[PDB]
Amino acid sequence: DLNVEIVAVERELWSGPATFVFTRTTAGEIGILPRHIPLVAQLVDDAMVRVEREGEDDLRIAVDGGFLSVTEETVRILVENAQFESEIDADAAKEDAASDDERTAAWGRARLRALGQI
Amino acid sequence: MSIFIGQLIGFAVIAFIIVKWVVPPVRTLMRNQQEAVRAALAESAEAAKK
Amino acid sequence: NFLIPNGTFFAVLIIFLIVLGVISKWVVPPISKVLAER
Amino acid sequence: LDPNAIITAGALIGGGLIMGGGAIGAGIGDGIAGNALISGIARQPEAQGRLFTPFFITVGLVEAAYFINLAFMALFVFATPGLQ
Amino acid sequence: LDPNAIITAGALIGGGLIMGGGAIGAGIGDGIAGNALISGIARQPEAQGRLFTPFFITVGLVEAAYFINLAFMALFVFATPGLQ
Amino acid sequence: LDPNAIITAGALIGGGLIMGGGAIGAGIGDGIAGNALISGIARQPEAQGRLFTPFFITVGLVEAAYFINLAFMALFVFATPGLQ
Amino acid sequence: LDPNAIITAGALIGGGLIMGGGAIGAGIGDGIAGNALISGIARQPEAQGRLFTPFFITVGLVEAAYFINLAFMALFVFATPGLQ
Amino acid sequence: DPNAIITAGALIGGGLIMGGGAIGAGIGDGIAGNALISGIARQPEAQGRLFTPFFITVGLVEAAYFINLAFMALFVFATPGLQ
Amino acid sequence: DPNAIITAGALIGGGLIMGGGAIGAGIGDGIAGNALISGIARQPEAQGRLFTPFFITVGLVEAAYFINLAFMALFVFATPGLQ
Amino acid sequence: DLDPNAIITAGALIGGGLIMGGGAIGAGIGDGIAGNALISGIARQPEAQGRLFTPFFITVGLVEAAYFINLAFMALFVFATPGLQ
Amino acid sequence: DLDPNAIITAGALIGGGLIMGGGAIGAGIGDGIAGNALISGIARQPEAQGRLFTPFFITVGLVEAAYFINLAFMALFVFATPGLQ
Amino acid sequence: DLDPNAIITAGALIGGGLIMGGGAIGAGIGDGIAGNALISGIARQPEAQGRLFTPFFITVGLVEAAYFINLAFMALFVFATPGLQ
Amino acid sequence: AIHVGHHTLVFELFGMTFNGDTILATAVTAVIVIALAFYLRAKVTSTGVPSGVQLFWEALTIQMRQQIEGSIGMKIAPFVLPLSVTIFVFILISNWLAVLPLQYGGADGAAAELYKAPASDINFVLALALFVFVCYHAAGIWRRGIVGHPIKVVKGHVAFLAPINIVEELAKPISLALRLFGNIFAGGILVALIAMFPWYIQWFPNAVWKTFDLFVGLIQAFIFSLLTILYFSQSMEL
C-alpha cells in the first residue's frame, strides 16, 4: 500500500496507509497508486481528496491550499487547511458558495465537492 | 461580358463585406490611436502649464 | 515557357530602386523623427 | 483499344485516389480530435459538454473534405468528364 | 485489348487504393485514439468506465469512414462503372 | 490509341492525385488544429471565445490549400492543358 | 494481348497496395498504442492489468483492419474478381 | 502521337507534385496552428509574440508548397521535351 | 507475352509490399523506442519492467512487417496466376 | 511508331514529379515541426526570441538542404534526362 | 513484340524504388524520433546520458537493421530479378 | 521496334525518383523532429547548449546517412542503369 | 482556353525583351506608393492629430523597428529599416490592386485582366529576391569584409556541416523569389478558372476567393519582409 500523510500548516492532520488516492490537480484529475512515479503538483483552488483504504469506506476531504507530492515511498499533501466530510455543514457551504470573494467561493466549492453534492 | 458582370457582382460583395465587417473595427482602432496621441499632447501641454 | 527570365527582370528593379529612395528620405526619416519627438 | 475503355480506367483510378486520400484524411482527423476529447475528459470530467461543441466543429471540418471527395465519385465514375 | 480487360484492371487498382487509404486511416487514427485512452487510464484509473463512451464515438467515426470506404471498393470490384 | 483519350485519362489520374493530396493535407491539418483547440478549451473553460481567433487563422490556411487543390483538380478534368 | 494477363497484373498491384497500406497503418497504430502503454506503465505500474485491457482493444481495432486487408488478398490475388 | 504520351505523363507528374505540396502545406499549417493555439491557451498577454514565429513558420511551409505550385507550370503548361 | 506483364505487375506489387512493411516497422519502432527512452530518462531503474511491454510492442509491430515478408514467397517466387 | 524520346521524357518527368512530391512533403513537415518547437519555446521562454533561433535554423537548414538537393536532382532529371536518346 | 526482359526489369526497378522509398521513410522517421527521445532525456538528465545510450541503440538498431533487410532486396529486385527471362 | 532500352531506362528513372522521394521524406521528418527536440531542450535547459549537440549531431548523422545511401543507390539506378540489354 | 501566362503588349529594346503588362503593373504600384509618400510628407504632424495615412505609416515603421531591434540593433544596420518597409508595402500594393474589377473578356473565352499582380511574373519576384540577396551579402561584406564573410558563411553556425551551409546560402534567394510567384500565380490561375462560370455562378466563388486573397497577400508580404530582416540579421553577427 501507499502511505498518505496529509500535513496541514498548523498541524499534521492525518497519516495512514491506503490503497488508492484521487485528487484534482491543476493539470487534471490524478490517481495515485503504490508505485506511482514521484511527482509534484498544485491542487486546484477548489480541490478535493478521496483516499480509498483497505476495509474502510473511502475518506473524502475538502482541501484549500492543496499541494501534492508523490515520493518513492509515501504521498504527502501539504495543505493550508482541510475539512473531513463528517464535520462540514451544508447550509454554510452553500451560503458562501459562488460568492464574489474568489477564496470564499473556491473553499465553499471544495467543501461541497467533498460532501459529494458537487 | 457575362464574366464582367459576375466579376462586378463579386467585387460589390467584397466591398459590402469590407464596409460591414472590416471598416468599423479598423476605423475604431485608428480613432483610438488618434485619441491616445491627442491625450498625450494635451497632457504634456497641461503639465507644462501646471 | 513564359517562366524563362526576361529583360523585364532588370527594368522592374530600377522602379523598385527609385521607390526605395523616396522611402529612404520622405517616409522613414520623418516617421522616425516624429516617433522620437513623441 | 477502345478510347472509352482507357478513359474509364483512368477515371476509376482517379476516383480510387480520391477516396483513398479522403479516407486517410477523415480517419486521421477523427482520431486526433478524439484523442484531444478523451484527454480533456480525463482532465475535466465535468467539461464534457463544453468540449463537444468545439470538437464537433473540428470533426465536421475533418469530415467536410471527405464528403467533397465522396461527391467527386459521382463526377468521376458516374459522370466521367471527357467521356467520348 | 478487350475493353472489359482494361476496365477491370483499372477497377482492381482503384480498389487497391481504396483499401490502402482506408487501412492507413482506420489503423493509425484508432491507434492515436487508443493512445489517448490509455494515457487517460494511466493518469487516473477510475475514469475507465466513463471514458469508453467518448472513445467508442471516436472509433465509430474512424471506423465508419473506412467501412464506408470499403463499400465503394466492393462496387469498383463487383459493379464497375462504365463496364463496356 | 486516340491522343485525346490518353491525355484525358492522364488528366483524370492527375486530378485524382491532386485531390488525394489536398484531402490528406486538409484532414490532417484540420485535425491537428482541432486537437489543439480541444485541449486549450479543456485547460481553461472560459477562454474558448479567444481560442477561436488563432484557430480560425490556421484553418484559413489549411482549408485554403484544399480549395487550391480543388481548383487545380477542375483545371485537370474540364480544362486539360495541352489537349490538342 | 491475353486479357487474363492484364487482369492478373492489375490484381497483383491492387493487392500490393491493399496489404501495404494495411501494413503501414498497422505498424504506425501499434507503435502509437505501445507508446501509450509504455508511458502508462512508467507512470503507474500498479495499473498493469488495468492498462493491459484497454490497449488490447486498441490493437483489436487496428490489427483487425490489417487482417481484413490481408483477407482481401484472397479476394484479389487468388479469387481475381472480374477475371475473363 | 508521342506528344500525347509526353503530355499525359507530364500531367501525372505535375499532379503528384501538387499532391506532395498539399500534404506538406496542410501538415505544416496544422502543426504551426496547434503550437500557437497551445501557447495562447497557456498565456493571452503575448499574442503577438507567438504570432510572429508562427508567421515565419507558416511562410516556410507555404514556401515548400508553392515551390511545387510554381513547378506546376513547368510540368503541365511548358513541359520540357514536349517537342 | 503474358509472362512479361504478369511478372512485371508481380514485382511492382512485391516492391510496394516491402516498402509498406518497412514504413510500418520503422514508424512503430521509432515511437515505441521513444516511449521507452522517455520512460528510462524519467526513471532510470524502471528499465527492468519497461522492457517487458516494449518487447511486446515491438513484437506486435515487427511481426506484421515479418508477415509481409511472407508475401515475397507469394509475389516474386510463386506468383499466383503466372502464365 | 512509339518514339523512344517521348517515353523517356515522360518517365523522366514522372520521376521528377515524385522527387518534388517527396521533397515538398519532407520540407513542409520538418518546417512545421521545427516551428511548433520554436513557438512552444517562445511561449515557455518569453525573451528567447533570438536565443532559440540557432538550433531552429540549424534544423531548418538541414531540411531545406535535403529539399533543395531534391530540387537540383529533379531539374537534372527533367531538363537533362540521363541516358536520353 | 518488345522483349519480355525489358518490361520485366522496368517493373523490377519500379518495385525496388518503392522498397527503398518505404525503407528510407521508415528509417528516417525512426531515427529522428529515437533521437528526439534521447536528446530530451539528456536535456532533463544530463548525467543519465552515460546509460541512456543503451536502449537508444537497441531502438535504432531494430530500425537501422530493418533497413538493411530492404536494402538486400535491391539486389534481388535489381541484380537478380525473380522471373527474369 | 519498341526500344527496350527506352522502357528499361524510364523504369529505372522512375525507381530513382522513388528513391529520392522516400529519402527526402525520411530525412526531412527525422531532421524536423530532431530539431524539435533540440529546441525544446534548449528552451527548457539553455545551459546544455554545447552538450545537446552531441546526440543531435548523432541523429542527424544517422538520418543523413540513410539519405546519402539512397542518393548513392539512386545514382546507381539512373546514371548506370542495371539490366540494360 | 485557359490561356495561362502569355504576357500581353510585350516589346523589345536593345535586344532585351520586356512585358508591357508587368511593367505597367509595377509602374502603377510605384505611383500609388509614391503618392502615399507625398500624402505623408504634406500631412506630417508631430504636434497635432495625425492622419490616417500617418497612422498606417507609423504603425508599419514601429513594427518593423521592433523586429529589427529584436534581431539587430538599429545602430548597427539602420539601412535595414527603410529597405524592409519599401518591400512590404510594395508587395502589399502589388497584391492588393488585383482586387479591383479590371477583368474583361478576350473575345475567345480566355478572360483577360487589365491589371495583373507583378508578383505573378517571374521577373518581378526574381528582381526583388536577388536585390535583397545582394543587399544582405554586401552588408555582410561591409560588417566583416571579403576575407571574413566567406569563411563565416561557409562555416555557418557549425563549420563541419559546410556543404549544408552552402546549400542554405545558395537556396535562400531561390525560395525567397518564387514563393511570391507561387502565392500570386495560384490566385491568378484560380480567378481565371472561376471566370469560366456565368455571372450568376461566378459572382460568389470570386467574392470568396478575393476575400481570402486579401489575407493571403497581406500575410505573404509580412512574411517576406520579416524573412528579409531575418536574413539581414543572420548575415551580420560576430
Residue numbers in the entry:
A (entry chain H): 3 to 120
B (entry chain d): 1 to 50
C (entry chain b): 23 to 60
D (entry chain M), E (entry chain L), F (entry chain N), G (entry chain T): 3 to 86
H (entry chain O), I (entry chain S): 4 to 86
J (entry chain P), K (entry chain R), L (entry chain Q): 2 to 86
M (entry chain a): 10 to 247
What's written in the study?
Further round from S1b by ca. 2° lie S1c to S1e, which have similar c-ring positions to each other, but there are large differences in the F1 domain and in the PS. The positions of the top of the PS suggest that the order of procession is S1a > S1b > S1e > S1d > S1c. However, alignment of the substates via the “crown” in the F1-domain shows that they have identical nucleotide occupancies and that the position of the γ-subunit is also maintained. During rotation through S1 in either direction, the γ-subunit approaches very close to the PS at b′Arg72, and potentially a salt bridge could form between this residue and either γAsp170 or γAsp171. Each nucleotide binding site in the three α-subunits and in subunit βTP is occupied by an ATP molecule with an accompanying Mg2+ ion, while the site in subunit βDP has ADP and an accompanying Mg2+ ion. The sixth nucleotide binding site in subunit βE contains an ADP molecule with neither accompanying Mg2+ nor phosphate.
As do other ATP synthases in eubacteria, chloroplasts, and mitochondria, the enzyme couples a proton-motive force (pmf) across the IPM generated by respiration to the synthesis in the F1-domain of the enzyme of ATP from adenosine diphosphate (ADP) and phosphate by a mechanical rotary mechanism. The mycobacterial PS is made of two proteins, bδ and b′.
